[PDB]
Amino acid sequence: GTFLFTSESVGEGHPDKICDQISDAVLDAHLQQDPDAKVACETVAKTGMILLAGEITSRAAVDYQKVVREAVKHIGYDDSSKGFDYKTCNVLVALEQQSPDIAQGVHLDRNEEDIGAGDQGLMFGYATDETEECMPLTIVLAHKLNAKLAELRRNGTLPWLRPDSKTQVTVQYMQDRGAVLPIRVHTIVISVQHDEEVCLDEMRDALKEKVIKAVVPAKYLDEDTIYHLQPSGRFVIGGPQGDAGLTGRKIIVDTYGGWGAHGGGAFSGKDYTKVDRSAAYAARWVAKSLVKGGLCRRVLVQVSYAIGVSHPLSISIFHYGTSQKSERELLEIVKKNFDLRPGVIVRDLDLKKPIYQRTAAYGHFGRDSFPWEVPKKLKY
Amino acid sequence: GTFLFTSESVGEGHPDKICDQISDAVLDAHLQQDPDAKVACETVAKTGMILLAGEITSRAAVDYQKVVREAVKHIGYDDSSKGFDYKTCNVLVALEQQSPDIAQGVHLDRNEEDIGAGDQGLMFGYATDETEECMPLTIVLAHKLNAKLAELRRNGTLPWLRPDSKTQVTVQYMQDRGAVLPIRVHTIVISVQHDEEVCLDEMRDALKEKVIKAVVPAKYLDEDTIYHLQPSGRFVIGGPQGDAGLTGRKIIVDTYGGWGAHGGGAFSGKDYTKVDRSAAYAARWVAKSLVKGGLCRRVLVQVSYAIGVSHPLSISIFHYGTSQKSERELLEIVKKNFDLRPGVIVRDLDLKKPIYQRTAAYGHFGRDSFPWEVPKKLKY
Ligand SMILES: C[S@@+](CC[C@H](N)C(=O)[O-])C[C@H]1O[C@@H](n2cnc3c(N)ncnc32)[C@H](O)[C@@H]1O
Ligand SMILES: C[S@@+](CC[C@H](N)C(=O)[O-])C[C@H]1O[C@@H](n2cnc3c(N)ncnc32)[C@H](O)[C@@H]1O
Ligand SMILES: COc1ccc(-c2c3c(C4CC4)nnc-3ccn2O)cc1
Ligand SMILES: COc1ccc(-c2c3c(C4CC4)nnc-3ccn2O)cc1
């Protein structure tokens, strides 16, 4: 009845995550001046370079040099000794207006509630009662390990830490009538960029004592837990110098860590008309509402859209055997309580608010009581 | 007992797919001269630009201008009237050597069989008996609709077609003791870039009669099937001009269309030491072997790795209730028959061969009898 499951997370200075945070800093900069900005901002990061590529139609006057550099400063890349510096890096901009063919097919001359989906696609929402925040323990732990590294770097406890990090947690679970119960942590991996002065044994000791023990409850750790701490042996070169980063290359870290399902769409750098983001947020909101509402212990929701069409093409619900109600009954409850048109989701989840940079590291779900994390009281 | 499931696919000229094909053309160019090339090539595409960013350490002498332009020519972007031209686009190169810290931790001075995983991560393999190729019908149909568009464009039947396309198929399934049985096609979406001369009604008629009817068996289509053909109403601007493309932004199209599970890793532009590709291919090979071997009707395999470590950290198997054997029994069969170290997978699946550009459109699985699609005869 037991099984293993592994999830990973990355830190704020992982090059792909730098890109997601810059793309969302650009989106927020536009939304601060024009709540109806149409934004599709991709970011690429490599040694010394941030390139913005995409499409933006907006009435805002945005200083891209300032927005980009301020986001890199927040992450912690502020000196050539760290491999990247917000003060002196190259910021290249290849941004054009949104395609008029897309604009006419999606939102031009359309009533806001009846705007079409900004693209076709499929999206999933997932929730599990295994944690209070309704997220898998594997991904919650993996995110908290990266957050702890950033905390210890920023407070000066471990001054040899640099912003680029990755973590991975394998948990042994027990099956329980469709639901899952965490038993113990089987393996933890941590890799983090570091300075040239600190030795490997000092790093491994700190990662176990000051990071793992500060995040993972002792009840999950035992004599058999496997630790792979700094397994490469050396990680001085890091950030964009060590590996090219792109927006939307950490979509499983952004969501459920492999649990549930994913439709493929990236979140960062997109306004609400892009259903890859808004409909995934709404699907998480529906899933969490079904679990917090006591209708299921674990649930998966799929929705799909066609470009230019407001209503979803399909809606499906899988309760893993954890509900007394059938899928048909749960779908009827969802139809009575939710309107999954993008032009209505924007109002329910306040998606013109410039809070997106906050979502772009540590996962979009299970944190900080964002609107999609506040369950809706269901009427049925 | 019935439910809906939707998957999507994209064409060869979808901007993200252009990037995956260019990244894999670069990898193949290196492997043709140096089978041990270390390649991590990301591609970005926007109006008039192909940018290569990443890390390559190789003994090959590669003409990036020629490799990139030949890949774009193959896709069909050969004139400014189409929005992109291989002859006149800008090709920018930001490629550096692989980080020496990664090289020392992964493969330097290591016996090939004992090379470490090129990164940490989680990967899944999936197989389903619903089609002979062991793939979900939703994604098989979605890929075939894009392939039909490219065929009709290349043979001159529909000369108004351009290379950028997207498709989406929703199938109504019946549950069958853990396995799934397709009943009918509920909805199809097709969007394809076109010239300025053809009218919307001519395109919609051709998409139904020459594309859908030529791909989807009539037994799946009925009076209630919903068609969204050219739903945006106009798609003249397309390819990188209409939307920025990046490598590794179609990872669900590349795999199972939402079925099974995904660990987040992209495939294109990476050599075998990057377990995001090799271990996902090996996991598909294990899953397909378990289904074709008669041990299950549907199966999901998860594997995970740590950078620098050769053996997987975890292996898990979920048979959806379609096997008489337990997960423990299936894991023992997998341990007896497979060695999932990257340095052994490379030999079993011939992963130094330059066939990667062929994998970069229409899915990596369920096609063309690649080594990971030829089931292993299991001994137990
Ligand atoms: C190992 S790199 C990816 C492979 C790389 N593109 C190559 O050229 O081999 C992927 C991520 O691992 C982390 N990383 C980079 N250098 C590392 C090192 N020396 N040891 C461990 N992890 C490292 C960074 O977070 C980086 O974004
Ligand atoms: C709709 S675009 C993505 C949104 C876009 N970045 C924006 O600025 O709104 C995504 C994909 O849809 C397709 N596409 C582009 N223009 C389109 C159009 N006019 N109608 C339908 N699909 C289109 C292309 O395959 C493109 O890569
Ligand atoms: C996509 O989300 C999932 C999540 C979990 C499971 C799963 C198992 C697995 C997965 C390969 C890791 N292995 N043993 C399992 C036993 C039960 N359950 O539920 C299946 C799918
Ligand atoms: C990730 O792969 C999957 C695939 C399919 C299912 C699934 C259902 C769904 C999903 C939301 C679409 N809806 N009704 C369902 C009934 C049965 N089964 O099996 C669950 C998970």
Curated annotation (Swiss-Prot), chains A, B:
Q: Where does Mg(2+) bind?
A: 16
Q: Name one GO biological process term.
A: protein hexamerization
Q: Which Pfam families match?
A: S-AdoMet_synt_C (PF02773), S-AdoMet_synt_M (PF02772), S-AdoMet_synt_N (PF00438)
The residues the record assigns to binding L-methionine are 55, 98, 243, 274
Q: Give the catalysed reaction(s), semicolon-separated.
A: L-methionine + ATP + H2O = S-adenosyl-L-methionine + phosphate + diphosphate
Region (Flexible loop) residue spans? 98-110
Query: Which Gene Ontology cellular component terms are annotated?
Result: cytosol; methionine adenosyltransferase complex
Please give the residue positions where the record annotates the modification N6-acetyllysine: 66
Q: Where does ATP bind?
A: 14, 164-166, 232-235, 243, 249-250, 266, 270, 276
What is the reported tissue distribution? Detected in kidney.
Record NCBIfam families: metK
Subunit arrangement? Heterotrimer; composed of a catalytic MAT2A homodimer that binds one regulatory MAT2B chain. Heterohexamer; composed of a central, catalytic MAT2A homotetramer flanked on either side by a regulatory MAT2B chain.
Miscellaneous remark of the record? Protein expression is regulated by post-transcriptional regulation: in presence of S-adenosyl-L-methionine, METTL16 binds and methylates the first hairpin of the 3'-UTR region of MAT2A mRNA, preventing recognition of their 3'-splice site by U2AF1/U2AF35, thereby inhibiting splicing and protein production of S-adenosylmethionine synthase. In S-adenosyl-L-methionine-limiting conditions, METTL16 binds the 3'-UTR region of MAT2A mRNA without methylating it due to the lack of a methyl donor, preventing N6-methylation and promoting expression of MAT2A.
Name the chain's protein: S-adenosylmethionine synthase isoform type-2
Q: Which gene encodes it?
A: MAT2A
